[PDB]
Amino acid sequence: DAGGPWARTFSERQQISNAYDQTVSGLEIGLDRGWSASGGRWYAGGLLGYTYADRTYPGDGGGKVKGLHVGGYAAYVGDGGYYLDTVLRLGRYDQQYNIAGTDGGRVTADYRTSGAAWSLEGGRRFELPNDWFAEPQAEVMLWRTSGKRYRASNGLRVKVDANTATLGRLGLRFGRRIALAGGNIVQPYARLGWTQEFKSGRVELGAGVDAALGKGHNLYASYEYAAGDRINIPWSFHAGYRYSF
Amino acid sequence: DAGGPWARTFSERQQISNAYDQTVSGLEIGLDRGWSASGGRWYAGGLLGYTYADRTYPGDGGGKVKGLHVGGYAAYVGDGGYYLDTVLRLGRYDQQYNIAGTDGGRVTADYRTSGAAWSLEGGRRFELPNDWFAEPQAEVMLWRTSGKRYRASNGLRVKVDANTATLGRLGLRFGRRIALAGGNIVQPYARLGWTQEFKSGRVELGAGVDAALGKGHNLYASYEYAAGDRINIPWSFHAGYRYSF
């Protein structure tokens, strides 16, 4: 690979508990160029995304969330098996919140907001007999959302909070690299992960397949499930395509 | 008078400054019974009211406010010329606020609230040559509004504040008691007043006429204008009728 275009979709249902359930869906599109740094292989490039979060509070109601974002990233891939990516995302959001107060009271909201998310991720691939691999991975993630706050004089006050959150993520995948008649590479794996959040914890189990289908094509699909403290993700799908061009 | 039914309407435009203009309109209805306490004349009774406040913020929008209230009151009237009334009002309100954030953001609100207002008022009538009178008056007023506050998790916060406010009021009226052929009493006066508010200042000028029209009827009408710090009341009308039954 000397770089290429790529597209990735995704969709994850969160059941976050006391309590709201949201469905987060997205689409990224992107391009990088690659080069030979001796000992490794370097990748730099950028991306464009949509993102849609659809939420629900119990009796009440909840928000919808739409957003464009752009981003830039570098990736290294070592001969020895080390990888790391860092990625910077800048986003603008549009939320239409819609609540109820069980007393009968109905508050409506509608506003734009700004986000950034920076993440850094690395890990190593240890090959094992019969083309099975082992792959520990670490991902720290930082992001900020912007605030807003106004006020109808002699009465009402509305504040949107600028929350700002760190993530750590630990995980391991086991798979087999398996070569089909022709040139194809189907490469299944199953994945175990832990992740937590300080925002100014949970375990995840999933499985995927990444195929290299001869003539520059690449397909990835994975499923993920997570249970945790606040958190509960009955399903989380990612599908991705890349052209080695 | 041994008591009777009464109705009073009113409407006052406030231009309160940095900035919102509101029009406050109302209707009270009420009844009291009267008796002879030697040296004076005592009045006790109750009332029912509607009240409508229609507000406006600059570019933005603003609220509407509807409310039922009930109340109870006593009044004393001395032979010597001293009067005092105390009145307790209990109310429930319905506000539909509607704002804009000049950034494009639109927040909507809709809720019920509770109020009470207790006031105590007194003063003396000094008669002067040719049936002109002088009448200093003092009015302290206490009232509380109730609060409300909810919150869309991991985002938005809405607070309505329970404000709670004292008023002092100083004023003087000069008029002439004037007796028409038959039995009628037209009694004009002009009125100067000061009032301020600690809420956890301004001067007022107006004029009225109170008629006793033979056979138990009573009519009052007044106009009032006020200018002050925060405050500016280009107009404030009160009309009232009472049947001496």
By secondary-structure content and strand pairing, the structural class of chain A works out as mainly beta
Biggest interface and its residues per chain?
A-B, 33 and 33 residues
Please identify which CATH superfamily of chain A we are dealing with. Answer: Autotransporter beta-domain
How many helical elements of chain A?
A: 0
Largest sheet of chain A: 12 strands, antiparallel, barrel
Oligomer: homodimer
CATH class of chain A, named Mainly Beta
The amount of beta strand of chain A, in percent, is over 45%
Shape summary of chain A: elongated
CATH topology of chain A: Lipocalin
> Which radius of gyration of chain A do the C-alpha atoms yield?
21 Å
Helix content of chain A: under 10%
Indicate how many domains the architecture of chain A comprises: 1
| Total count of strands of chain A | 16
Element pattern of chain A in H and E: EEEEEEEEEEEEEEEE
Domain Autotransporter (chains A, B): 1-245
Subcellular location (chains A, B): Cell outer membrane
Protein name (chains A, B): BrkA translocator
Organism (chains A, B): Bordetella pertussis (strain Tohama I / ATCC BAA-589 / NCTC 13251)
